[model samples]
Target: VDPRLYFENRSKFIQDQKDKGINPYPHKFERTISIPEFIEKYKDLGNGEHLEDTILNITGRIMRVSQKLRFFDLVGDGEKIQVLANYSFHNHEKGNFAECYDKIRRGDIVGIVGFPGKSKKGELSIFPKETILLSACLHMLPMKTEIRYRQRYLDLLINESSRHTFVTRTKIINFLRNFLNERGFFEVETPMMNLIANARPFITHHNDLDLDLYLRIATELPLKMLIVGGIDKVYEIGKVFRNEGIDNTHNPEFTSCEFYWAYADYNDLIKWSEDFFSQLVYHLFGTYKISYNKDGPENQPIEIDFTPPYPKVSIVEEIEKVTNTILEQPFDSNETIEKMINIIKEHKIELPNPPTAAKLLDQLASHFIENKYNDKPFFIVEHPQIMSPLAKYHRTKPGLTERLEMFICGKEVLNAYTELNDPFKQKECFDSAFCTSLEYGLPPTGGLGLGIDRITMFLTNKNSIKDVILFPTMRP
Candidate 1:
């Protein structure tokens, strides 16, 4: 690992400040305004509108510094305001104000008591009469330049748009939780530590217990156990772990939400998935029409008109249309089929390759075709039998299952399967799916796992899952 010389310099700064009998760290700074409240109350103010009286006690990172005077901007609670500590201001009397200003590092947390006013240039500004260090950041921040702005927390302090985007993320998450709660779906918790990891078994084990364990790969296993215990309508929003390399969209540990409903088939769950997304998006982005080109897909503007009752395209049809690879074409030889698979694989296509009959059709619909055609928000229902081991088979389709996965912003956000109720069939599935993995030296199980952090990213248009999760998994 490379040494952090900038961070090393910051520690020296902290030490120097402390040696001067100025404690760099203090207990607290009560603020009179939150970022959202400030924006809402004063959004309409024109240049010099208030003239003086918007006094606020704010604390935040010192993002910018002016060379001419003892002045800088203090960012707090995700917003920024200017502060002047010239000899005439209240706290400047404590010591030499210019030297004090010179001592202030970019990332140190400081609180200021100030009145909002217009500068000579007519920018919304604050003039502080008192200043105190509320907390200390012992390092230089990422550069304040435009290119590195997003990498620095300073942008979040100075940029109104960045602050608002974070606010939108919070509002959407809370709203989704409330929406589910109001609909009578009980939220449940599950263990993050488990005996078997799903998909691939890369996990860390507890040292003291002497028993092998892995971080949870999916919430599906325990949620199904709840069904067996007779808690029919339930959902879970928790962290799942995978032993894997990180990427733009992939994180080792991520959040997920899964729900199970008794007596509902794909027909019933499909409606729920559609309505849930519609309500959440409208509440967050303010409308059904969202535009973005995810993963650098086709260059033309992809407008996802999340209009409920959106269009539906079957798996075989959509894939052939989007990538010109047909799954339904009966292969004359293994060579021809392998060619098609290679093409789909190159697109990193997501299609159900279920190990059972009932889930086969749903996999074809959701994973195969519809997943690649996320030009808008839509649902792909009725998977093939081999694809969905946890869903009930359709009555009419001999080898298809009742399941649905919702796709929007060119990603799978919501997935729900009509809880497979038949104990005999479920037992058969467990034995079959589990036994196959076991035979191949893998964990045995069946469950639905949607990346909650990823969903939040898509719904909020966040650039990365880490931006949404306050603390994403980092290696120890």
Candidate 2:
């Protein structure tokens, strides 16, 4: 439908209602029960179980209107009930009910006082005794995906799947909160605008504070501060921003969950994480397997197994095996770097900007190691020290850190490590970027950062970050 003509028709309806001294938009509508409640309460109603004389008020948008406004489908919170208006049943003092009903259309909010009844076709429905126009829709909703993202409220109205995605996202988050709390992990809040964590921060000028600040790239520093302050176990679930480009899997702004557990090593955390994933899968999906490829029916389904005791692979070993290059020397040695660069050139992988050693190894792992284990969840452990500065050095591996990143479908979903606690070493790790003195001693800590958006995407079988995020950044 042409939006301009639709707007004109809507405006005419509003003006006509005004000329008739009827308010197109009313202040409020008192509802007796939500549509879900109505469905449950009357679910057992048989053919003759209709409450013919009893009345209940329901408020919802008109999803569909019958020809000549004889009846309509009122939808509330994903519940649909047919509303009939024959004008013989409803008597109003103010005016003709059919005339008033004619002004309302699909997408218009309406309140109906009706008797619960079953239609001739045996569907549970409502027989209206009165109707009130609550709100008007000026334009018809476009069904395109790009338009849906721009106008999410309308999308929620039109797309049942989108609504379900958001509802499931809430349940997943709530379950995480309860799961952490039960494990004695205190939830904490941290500053969103901080310069310490590893992010290309979104710079903002704070005129009131007479300073510039950056949106936090990660919640690691502040969370570790709590760990240092004797809060032995703490977790933060919040937004972290990165001034970075967008992609199918990456969003500039995203939600992340990071937890710091004092006196726990990465090895212990690895086991705990496995258990966490298993319990979460059982809680949300009732199984350890989730099938992706919802939008690609032609492609084979991607089923990921969340079974516990996910196997672990040494990043160095895996890279060496896949690239067929021997690195007998230390991980940070020039020999290893030269070999990696050579493999990168051979594979034709584009180097990350600035082409740091850490980025080089990361790309190598993505190309060589991650793709090798896409069917089962696994951890790529024992990253080079340069790749994991905040992580403690491995006890036996030379120049390697006790770090592990969890991957599924060749995507990194979780990062964790035995946190570096020595103040001197941490300072060196930060490379003078440390916000405050970690002068006080910090105990051996295990820290984990989980991408909430990515996890939800995985669970919901959504292929893009935009599908999981309610309002992803989009160009105007």
| lDDT (10s digit) by residue, model 1, range 1-476 | 22377777767877887898888777667888764565556655676655455578766678777743576766666656566554655565666655656767777777777666655565556666667776666655555233223443555644566667667767766876787788777888988787656256566657898887777777776666665566666788776767777776788777777776655555566667678777877876778778665644445445666777765554444655765654542332455456555664575755345322223333334445655556667666655555566566666755555556667655566666555555556545442334343232211212344566776676656656666655455533
lDDT of 2 by residue, 234-352 (tens): 99999988888898888989999999998888668898889888888888888888888834657778777888888899988888777778865565577777777888888788877
TM-score between model 1 and native: 0.73
Report residue 15 deviation for candidate 2 (angstroms): 1.5
How many angstroms is residue 77 displaced in model 2 relative to the true structure, after the best TM-score fit? 1.3
Error of 1 at 325 (Å): 13
Question: Whole-model lDDT for model 2 versus the true structure?
Answer: 0.82
Question: All candidates' lDDT scores?
Answer: 0.62, 0.82
Global local distance difference test of model 1: 0.62
TM values, all candidates: 0.73, 0.94
CA RMSD per model (angstroms)? 6.8, 2.3
Please report how far candidate 1 places residue 31 from its true position, in Å.
Answer: 5.3
